[PDB]
Paper text:
The utility of this method is illustrated by way of an XP Screen against [name], a cytochrome [name] enzyme from [name] (Mtb) championed as a validated drug discovery target. Whilst the precise function of mycocyclosin remains unknown, ablation of [name] expression via genetic knockouts showed the enzyme to be essential for the viability of the bacterium in vitro; [name] is thus seen as an important target for anti-TB drug research. The [name] binding pocket has been shown by X-ray crystallography to accommodate ligands in three distinct regions (i) binding to the heme group, (ii) binding in the cYY region and (iii) binding at the top of the binding pocket.
Compounds 4–37 were screened crystallographically against [name] using soaking experiments. X-ray crystal structures of compounds 10 and 21 with [name], whilst of better quality, still suffered from incomplete ligand electron density, either lacking complete density for the indole moiety (for 10) or lacking density for the central linker (for 21). Compounds with lower cLogP proved to be less problematic, with both 10 (an X-ray hit) and 55 (the 5-hydroxy derivative of the key X-ray hit 14) also showing evidence of activity (protein melting temperature shifts of +3.5 °C and +0.5 °C respectively).
Numbering used by the authors: 2 to 396
Write the structure that this text describes.
Amino acid sequence: TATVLLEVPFSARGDRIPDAVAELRTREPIRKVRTITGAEAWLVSSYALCTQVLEDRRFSMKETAAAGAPRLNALTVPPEVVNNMGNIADAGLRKAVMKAITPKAPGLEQFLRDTANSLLDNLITEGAPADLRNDFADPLATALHCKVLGIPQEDGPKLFRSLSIAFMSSADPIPAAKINWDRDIEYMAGILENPNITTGLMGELSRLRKDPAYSHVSDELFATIGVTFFGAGVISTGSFLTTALISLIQRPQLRNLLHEKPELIPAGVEELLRINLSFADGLPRLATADIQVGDVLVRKGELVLVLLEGANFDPEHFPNPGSIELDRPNPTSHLAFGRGQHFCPGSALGRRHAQIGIEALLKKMPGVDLAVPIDQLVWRTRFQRRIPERLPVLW
Ligand code: HEC
Ligand SMILES: c1ccc2c(CCc3ccncn3)c[nH]c2c1
Ligand SMILES: [Cl-]
């Protein structure tokens, strides 16, 4: 009997990789799929072909936003925002933005530790079960990014609540996304004019905005940087830490090891990054030329989806890919942060967020365990991240 073209994404579950991924990688590591919009795309699932695509700018991020292109999903932002990093670079702002979002600012790591410990103390006081997503990982991400941006902690929750819509992976445009986007842009425009905001990313952007060397950079770009980096950083660190905590809880031997030897936590987090399923969709690129990828000649104008867990569970690059092994020879060579032109600018901050969050959790609740059977986690659908709606634990 006839079947439709293979549809992506395969599963919204972030606690297991579908067997279909390895079968695809082995039989057809670049293969045609249908996205939720109905568009066809090339799904790339081997490490070698994923890196090839991400390292060839002729597979363009920016052009995925072009009118009439085959789409993975509907834009939730103005099309120029897809090229936000490119616009930042063209405005002469890349170095300043990068420096503002490193975890090395004085007191930043102590802020993370203090915040994590305070959130955990509150959970211990409230008593089990505790929701490690809504009452730990996401508030820690939100507090971190208010600090990094230089904006008041009390503004975090409202900005955060845009994100369950802003990072939707939808077949169609989302009216609420524009409502929240325009509102959050207005907020950050006000931040740039707010004399109290003198630290962090927005403090620096506010200064550069009045510097004659940036007098022709648009106010829209300055505001957009704030919304984009808050949203990307918070959704990415919150979702990654949440699904990392699941992987850690499901490995009590690793939890005990990292609890007893915290110096191993960075290597543990690198492996948790490698096996992380937080990205719900392949990374999209639009071909701007005819390009050979494996056995397929990708044609100009076609959509390519780089499946991160395809690369990161590829046994030809990461032997025994499903196992967390702290002594791999190539531990940071995973694609959790992408690769090439669009490699994540917040990679160092995301690493520190997770390392400190896990260190604090293991000290405060060494006996942490799921409080529900793992299958009972509710996996958010049609979203750019895989996350459980609640993460109930006991300890
Ligand atoms: C505070 C900012 C920030 C943080 C923190 C952050 N991201 Fe990023 N990330 C970005 C931005 C902005 C981009 C777009 C870069 C570009 O287009 O050049 C990006 C790009 C990426 C990409 C590549 C996307 C592509 O299409 O090539 C991946 C993958 C990624 N981030 C994953 C993560 C993960 C995983 C984490 C946490 C563990 C994280 N990011 C934390 C802001 C952030
Ligand atoms: C693929 C998907 C999304 C993006 C973005 C914007 C991400 C964002 C930020 C805040 N609210 C909503 N979305 C920039 N480059 C991208 C590539
Ligand atoms: Cl504050």
